[PDB]
Every structure is written in C-alpha cells, then in structure tokens.
Ligand binder design. Structure first.
Ligand SMILES: [Zn+2]
Length: 7
C-alpha cells in the first residue's frame, strides 16, 4: 500500500 506522513 502507499504511505503518507504529514507532520
Ligand atoms: Zn505498501
């Protein structure tokens, strides 16, 4: 799956 981190 794809992963995104928005700090
Ligand atoms: Zn993945």
């Amino acid at each position: 799956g794809s992963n995104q981190n928005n700090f």
